[PDB]
Design a protein around this ligand. Sequence first.
Ligand SMILES: Nc1ncnc2c1ncn2[C@@H]1O[C@H](COP(=O)(O)OP(=O)(O)NP(=O)(O)O)[C@@H](O)[C@H]1O
Ligand SMILES: Nc1ncnc2c1ncn2[C@@H]1O[C@H](COP(=O)(O)OP(=O)(O)NP(=O)(O)O)[C@@H](O)[C@H]1O
Ligand code: PRO
Ligand code: PRO
Ligand SMILES: [Mg+2]
Lengths: 261, 259
Amino acid sequence: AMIIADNIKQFHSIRNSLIKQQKIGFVPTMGALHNGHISLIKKAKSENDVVIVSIFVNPTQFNNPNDYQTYPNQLQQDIQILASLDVDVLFNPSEKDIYPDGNLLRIEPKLEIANILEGKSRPGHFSGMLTVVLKLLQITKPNNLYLGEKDYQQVMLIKQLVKDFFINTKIIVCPTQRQPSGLPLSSRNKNLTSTDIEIANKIYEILRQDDFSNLEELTNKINSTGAKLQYIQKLNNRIFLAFYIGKVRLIDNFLKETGPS
Amino acid sequence: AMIIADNIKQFHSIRNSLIKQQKIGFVPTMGALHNGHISLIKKAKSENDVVIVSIFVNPTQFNNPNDYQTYPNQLQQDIQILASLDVDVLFNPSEKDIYPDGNLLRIEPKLEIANILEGKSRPGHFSGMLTVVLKLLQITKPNNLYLGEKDYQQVMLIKQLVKDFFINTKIIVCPTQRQPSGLPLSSRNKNLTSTDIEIANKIYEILRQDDFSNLEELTNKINSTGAKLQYIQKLNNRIFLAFYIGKVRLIDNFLKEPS
Ligand SMILES: Nc1ncnc2c1ncn2[C@@H]1O[C@H](COP(=O)(O)OP(=O)(O)NP(=O)(O)O)[C@@H](O)[C@H]1O
Ligand SMILES: Nc1ncnc2c1ncn2[C@@H]1O[C@H](COP(=O)(O)OP(=O)(O)NP(=O)(O)O)[C@@H](O)[C@H]1O
Ligand code: PRO
Ligand code: PRO
Ligand SMILES: [Mg+2]
């Protein structure tokens, strides 16, 4: 019963079948679906008449090519996961349908929140994500859109985007889903070995009780577990970080006062 | 009968009060209307049930400050003109309206056609225009967009923009309106002096005979008029050129065989 639009043409026909009198939620993803994804969907299903999920791994937002090839995909499973949530439409285009001409027109952010943290760390990542998210919104024309708090600046950036471009959509920000350790669910977590999860869980032991008072000391702890701490910083009440375990790269942010978990 | 909407909110309630059975044409402009502009509008009135003209001078497209200070305002004369055309809606917003938070998000082109001609001589300009046109379209949501062939690159660029961003609007291209001399109707012309105006026509009488076989010579000819030629080239079947007369900056493009 879930419909699958494999290309834009299919999706357009579906999309122009629905009335305006009714509510369309949209959850975009790169697939390899986990409990975090699933939470956004559920919430979408609670608030809307039609739920659209897209799965596209957008090339232009990967600054790291090996990351791009390394990126997990299991579509047949994602479809099964998606159909067991009674998702109405899976939009699953190819690069060729999103970028018929290649990437010739791009959103380039100039803001402070764009030059820090994830923005400094992955150059061009934000441009790419902003370009695809604009295109996805234009295609899906949703009433409601669901985003994880996990990628915080992503949310800010998309909030500005829909404002600046006069896109009529509510943005709902969903809380980050975590493991008991406090470790946030991530698709790239599939790529980490048993040895790494050990480290990862160690890191979160450290984070779970720590002051955040002294940041240089914490880096030292985290770097000692074998992961490479990339950035860690305080903004308002909130801590942000990124780090590598092996070749797998993970980000997190949470309220300083409460978290992770 | 013409609604003048000086802000987005006013404009929205107007935009969304309209039926699907009505076709909306849009003619974006920077104001200071001349017959070039009119020609576009006369063509929109003919193909549409509702015509929307906008006047916004977009700061973001200007790569020269004095060009921006220079840029001609006749707002009241423009309202008049737009009224004797029986234009339905005049949308003329302010900067706060269009860039509520400043200019944070930009359309940036990477293609050759944005790296040549007007693109070299006006850095930042194409990104500026693309951003405003995107906003303008996202706001007006029209069926038909009317653009002049005079800004050729821009036309090409807006054609890309529309296709890349999945906006359903037809692009309709309209022929350059000219003075008898062949000089293209232009807003900045209202800045030419009476003698500068005669220099323009000299330049165009020179263009009216050239086989365009030697451009350095055509160049020296143009420059001997007092003008300062910025560039001239053939790409495909056409000439593109731009030049200065004093402070005023003008451009053209046409088939090798400006009538
Ligand atoms: N643990 C999570 N809790 C809540 N939302 C999440 C979580 N993880 C991801 N999301 C959101 O799901 C959407 C898709 O994430 P996704 O695009 O698939 O790529 P990613 O962030 O680079 N790798 P991943 O960690 O799986 O998201 C985004 O809005 C994410 O913020
Ligand atoms: N002489 C002309 N003939 C036909 N169309 C024109 C002419 N001049 C301008 N237009 C078009 O009218 C629309 C608005 O132009 P405009 O906003 O005034 O920017 P512009 O290129 O600086 N125009 P201008 O300064 O008047 O030459 C654009 O699509 C133009 O290409
Ligand atoms: O462009 C993307 O892929 C990001 C990921 C979550 C939704 N938006
Ligand atoms: O209106 C504008 O912003 C310019 C001139 C017409 C098309 N682009
Ligand atoms: Mg994913």
